[PDB]
Amino acid sequence: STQYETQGYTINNAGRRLVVDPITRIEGHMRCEVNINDQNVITNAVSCGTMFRGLEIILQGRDPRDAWAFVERICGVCTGVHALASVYAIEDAIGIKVPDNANIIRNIMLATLWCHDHLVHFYQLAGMDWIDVLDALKADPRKTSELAQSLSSWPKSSPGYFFDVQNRLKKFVEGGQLGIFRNGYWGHPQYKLPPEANLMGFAHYLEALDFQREIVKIHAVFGGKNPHPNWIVGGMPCAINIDESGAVGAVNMERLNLVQSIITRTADFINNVMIPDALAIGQFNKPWSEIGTGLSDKCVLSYGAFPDIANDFGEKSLLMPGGAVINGDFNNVLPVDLVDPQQVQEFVDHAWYRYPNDQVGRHPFDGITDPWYNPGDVKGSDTNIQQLNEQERYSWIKAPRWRGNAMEVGPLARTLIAYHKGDAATVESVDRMMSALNLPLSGIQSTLGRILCRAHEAQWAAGKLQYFFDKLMTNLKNGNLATASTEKWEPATWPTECRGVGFTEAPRGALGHWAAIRDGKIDLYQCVVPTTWNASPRDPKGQIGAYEAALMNTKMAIPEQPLEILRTLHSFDPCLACSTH
Amino acid sequence: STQYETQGYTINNAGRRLVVDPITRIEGHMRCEVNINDQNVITNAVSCGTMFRGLEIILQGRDPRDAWAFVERICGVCTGVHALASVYAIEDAIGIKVPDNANIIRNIMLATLWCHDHLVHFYQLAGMDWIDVLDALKADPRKTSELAQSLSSWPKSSPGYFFDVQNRLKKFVEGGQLGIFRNGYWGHPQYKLPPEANLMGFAHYLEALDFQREIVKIHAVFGGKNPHPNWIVGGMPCAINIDESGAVGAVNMERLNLVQSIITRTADFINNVMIPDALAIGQFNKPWSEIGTGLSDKCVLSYGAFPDIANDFGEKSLLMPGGAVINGDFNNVLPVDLVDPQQVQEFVDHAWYRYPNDQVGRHPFDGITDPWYNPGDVKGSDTNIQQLNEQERYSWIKAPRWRGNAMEVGPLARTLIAYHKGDAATVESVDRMMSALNLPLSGIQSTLGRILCRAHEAQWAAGKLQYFFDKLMTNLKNGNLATASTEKWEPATWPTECRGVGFTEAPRGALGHWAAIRDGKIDLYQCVVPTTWNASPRDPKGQIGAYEAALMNTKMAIPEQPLEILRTLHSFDPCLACSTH
Amino acid sequence: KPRIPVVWIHGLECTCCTESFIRSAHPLAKDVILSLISLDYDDTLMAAAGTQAEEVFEDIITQYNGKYILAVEGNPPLGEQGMFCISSGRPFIEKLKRAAAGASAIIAWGTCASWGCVQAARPNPTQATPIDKVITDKPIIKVPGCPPIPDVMSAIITYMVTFDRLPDVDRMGRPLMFYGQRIHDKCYRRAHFDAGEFVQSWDDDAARKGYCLYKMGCKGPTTYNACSSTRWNDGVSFPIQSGHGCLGCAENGFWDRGSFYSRV
Amino acid sequence: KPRIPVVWIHGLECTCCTESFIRSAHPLAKDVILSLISLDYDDTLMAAAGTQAEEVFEDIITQYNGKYILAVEGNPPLGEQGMFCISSGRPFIEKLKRAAAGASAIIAWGTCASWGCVQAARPNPTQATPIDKVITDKPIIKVPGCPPIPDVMSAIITYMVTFDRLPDVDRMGRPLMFYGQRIHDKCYRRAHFDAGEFVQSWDDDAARKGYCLYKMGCKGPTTYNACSSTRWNDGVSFPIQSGHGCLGCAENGFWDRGSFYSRV
Ligand code: SF4
Ligand code: SF4
Ligand code: FCO
Ligand code: FCO
Ligand code: SF3
Ligand code: SF3
Ligand code: F3S
Ligand code: F3S
Ligand SMILES: [Cl-]
Ligand SMILES: [Cl-]
Ligand SMILES: [Li+]
Ligand SMILES: [Mg+2]
Ligand SMILES: [Mg+2]
Ligand code: NI
Ligand code: NI
To answer: What does the entry comment about cofactor binding (chains A, B)?
Structure first.
């Protein structure tokens, strides 16, 4: 066994080794290993992406106009965000400016995704870490109704409703076919909700499973379908016609009316179901404000998102702020530049890839994706990993760093960046939230805080849907219908050689696509995705990434039941297909 | 003035005359006049249909296969029922037998229309006679929640919901634009609900207005659209394909899944919203179990409906029983024969039509529709009527009689017939309802009872939707897909001269279409519709119809405000376009 | 802010257009009534009856003279001195003329108000006459169909409220947005039409594969509406999708163009 | 009354098919899970992880050997000894084979499981291989699309449950009900194709009237699916309705048939 110091942690691989493979209630394939000491506290954590497809390789030789369609299939959970980053990147390379309506519609697509993805994460992915479903069977329906009514105006609160939900659960489980609840962690001592809260939360799980399908009807209107809507280089393909012959063939007033109806319902669900549930998790799980901090009090990163001024990606345009904090110095939010070769770099000394020199990091314009499965001694064989060898290569995920620093990305990172840049809305919202929980601001830098911030962001995005819709309608009232620029659609109009960067804030954090075009075709296409940052393996300095850091120092009540590991990992909303691409 | 006796009433047109024209919260155009004595009690009532279109005339010379489409436009409220009666009539004339699936789908169409029409009537048409909308502003939201939860398991009952509904209402009327509530009867002494019950009812009015749109998606699947779905002579045009190429062009499993989802939702809304609200109206308005009896303790009529054995319209097949009671003798439910010239006849001595002898009634196969606007010695003039002359011709509605007796039709009539024939489900439902109210069985024979029976029937029909759906699926599992019989589609296959009767129970009561075909064309097409029965004018004996009888002897608190008249008329769900056609 | 006053009157009709309106999926008719317009008179929905309804009518058309929109469903009969349709003891036409005189604009909902519909089909016993043959000095927007599509009705309403203007119309007064193209030029069975793949009798093999309904009498080739694109009842279906040819119900005179089952 | 056991495994994938499933409008995915099947293993949704998830897998496939349905999303990579997709420390293909051996039938959801999809597009770095090239002794129902339509997935499930049998399939293993006809033979823009009325560049006048997308690269003429009839997301839209040509996403090899913007 060995030990070393990094980022204030003591990484010690002595002691019992625990393996969690597969990690469930995530997207894609992950393995996690930890070592625990004699007090059942984690002293080493190992994040491993257990899949790879090679989109960066597949994209070579494609027409740049087609790229969005391929890269959208990086991930069906954060569906759309890679298409958006792609069209941004290709437009940046070629020098294309899209019409205002196209930009507004793209912002609607992104905000729709934030609402959907954050909602489903809260309930379907993370929720069972916090709600003991089986314990709901012990709840009193009338006390459940009282609890729900004390927390929210949401209509669906009758005692008979909670009894009906409970009875449905009872009958589901009574024949022994527990389905997704089989062999869960029910009864673990870290389940702290009372039975009534478990029943309320379970009812809401089901309500969210039903309601989420409606949100994506916005994607169907503008993008044809969800999952995997359509886009174009130069804007969007959803031509608008409000008052002319043939509006039946276009986005017309009826289509826009449908979109508005979804916006209102989405805001109401998030504000009156998810928000009070998130706050209630916080109220009953306050100790988790001190667990899973990781890098969130050290190094956080946002690129920024939602340009409100079409084709302007600067600070005055982006409605979701960008910036970086390092060394715990939240008084100095630093600017990010995605072209600067000294900023974003990826290392592969601990990943299954080949570089000519694995002791150096490569900016994505110099990126290389040459897969090399080389696990070393794993106490089994190349086809039987019993214990990953974290002293050498242990993941399909590359290791991104920013100025050589290991960073956390995602809702909590973004919230901290906006708060510390002095965004007045963010400051007010976060202060009010922490006040309601009677916790200090530092309580947000935690596993609980990640969950709170995600819910915050769903509320913010639902509000921004209405803002963007209203902006589109204003343009239409002024007779501004354009949705595409085609001046540079034809390859004969493009530079013979050019490169560009497309960036945004996906639900899970900072996303970039770097594209080089030569002779009408993609010469290089490199992606650095939010879960690539968070789930990163180590670098030549031995620095650990966000997941490994957040797991460090965590107490486990019952080593064989990894509930505390699941809670912290799930709080980041891992997307392993995204991470590896 | 004059006075005469009929049917146990003293019809006396001395004294003050009141006019209600227009009658609102009905379909179509009606005028009502009454006389009321010094004691504010109605001593005379006059029912006038104030519209006519002449479908029976327009149908002459048409192709019988087209008739359903014309007669469906008799009415958009009970949309579909005239189409059904029409295809039945033409099939009866020609000798066509439809496949089982067509019959089952027709039964689904009819049950879907019962659910929709009865729900909307309860809330949108009759509801404001019972619920004081402005008094809902005085309710306590918590006490409203408690009341709702005491009555039902329906989820939507939180204090915050009722507050939100109340605040929407408060805002609505804040600018002084009261809309449909302007100049209503609010605060009349006959409004007996407490404020919490008014708020509960008003919330449900809005929920029903929203939900009703979903019910008719069943019509859209099988019939293309609602209002006014499509049908064919020989079955239905909605060909079925579950497991073959091209199922995308037909009723397939996805379409059937949509239907099933609507059935479940419809049953749940009726059973948990409409039923408890009907019972609550009863609890708070028990005196109305003794008001508006009219003909319901004397003479009631049902033809019967929902043949479960395809092409068999007999007593062993019809799921909704047929029969007649006269002379108050409910021990003698009599069989109805729609061909017998001595049974159904229409008189016009008090209506705006010509007959060779207006002192006799004509069976519909001998029917004549020769319009003659002749109001006689009115107060006012023929184009400016101040008072109809009920001693002369006073309506566009013909006067149907059964063996010379004036009958009530509709939900109460059907309930009484089924109860007294011993239909177990009807007996159990009625007995439970009347026990819940602590009222005798006779309390159903009243204005309140009409409303209670309507709610019972919505529940009955919702249950039958599932039964019919399951029968359809059983056939499909057995490889029985047929939806049309076409061996007699072409006119050359028809008898040169033939006649038929199509009958059913529309939401408002007994419906018949009588058709004669000659040389490939409609030679005669006569309709007798439920509101024709109920809103009938007098006959040569002076016998009064169901509306006039139910209004007799009614006390009015405030003569100038016709709330008690509206309550009783609306309890029959008048459809004036149906009545006159 | 105050909402725009709307007076909705009913002549000879079946009430299908009113029913269609309340089917709207987006915006819900509830929200139209509560938030978008002020529905100040409507015989189907209003609390007041009789003299109290007459007072509403008179108050609204007086207080909001020149400022209200008049919606009309149905039509006036010219036969029997207009007494085929009587309101407050007088011919309906007098109510129509009084309401029209104060209106800023008129929406003729449905084929009845636009053209005549079923009561005007041969031999037109009542001499039922479309609105624009009686009212000749007001803008009239025709929204035909029997009834028009629910979400077309609500989209037209929202357009007018949002954009503060009447929709642009074709030469017959129909909104271009929904009536500019034929059913047949947006019909999902057109591939079959072009290939000569037709239903020949009900429930044949062609019908079970969704072949074209031309030989069964579909009038889509001559009918302008949105049914094949926007569809009906939250987009669930339309006549042709459920196996029946278009009747032609949005077009003037559709009842008297021959049998629904005769071609073209 | 017990529900049919279902094991849902995931190879190399993007998870769109699982997302599509939960979009089902009728039956809701909730009701499928609670009432129609027993979804006994699914890495995206299940409570258990790690050793507890391994125990569920082993217990179900043993207890229900010969009786469960295997759903597969994604595919196995043959490169690097299968270690491009690792589950419980071992190649995914081992888990696929173990799960297949006990299954009564297999549902290959999506183009990944059916054919290969994006990871199999040139140059196929991982040697991603469709299910039916590895499992050769079991019924395999291919339900292609990237992803398949939500209500197509749920209709296939309910068909199998209700009728107690596999759907009839074409020569490629696709259900005839939804894959028997091409997009282009049920497309509502076919009138425009027939008339030579085409979008020529994005947002041109033709695009604003809903003209055909053939000249913009639509692959509807060679693609079998239900998108132009059943449509997507509760019938709200489909690619062509919202202005983009079909990519061909239900067809084997669609990524490598030339640019999406080059004509059939
Ligand atoms: S079904 Fe009617 S509208 Fe459609 S293609 Fe055939 S003829 Fe044209
Ligand atoms: S848009 Fe595509 S599928 Fe539709 S008609 Fe044109 S080429 Fe065919
Ligand atoms: N959100 C999201 Fe998916 C990840 N990680 C992307 O980009
Ligand atoms: N119900 C109904 Fe309409 C009437 N009366 C018919 O038939
Ligand atoms: Fe909506 S009233 Fe119904 S008949 Fe044809 S439009 Fe008229
Ligand atoms: Fe639903 S996993 Fe998404 S990529 Fe094309 S089908 Fe595969
Ligand atoms: S009959 Fe009418 S509803 Fe549409 S499809 Fe034809 S215009
Ligand atoms: S791209 Fe795919 S989703 Fe349908 S329209 Fe074409 S098969
Ligand atoms: Cl007409
Ligand atoms: Cl493929
Ligand atoms: Li740019
Ligand atoms: Mg990368
Ligand atoms: Mg008649
Ligand atoms: Ni993802
Ligand atoms: Ni009617």
So the answer is: Binds 1 nickel ion per subunit.
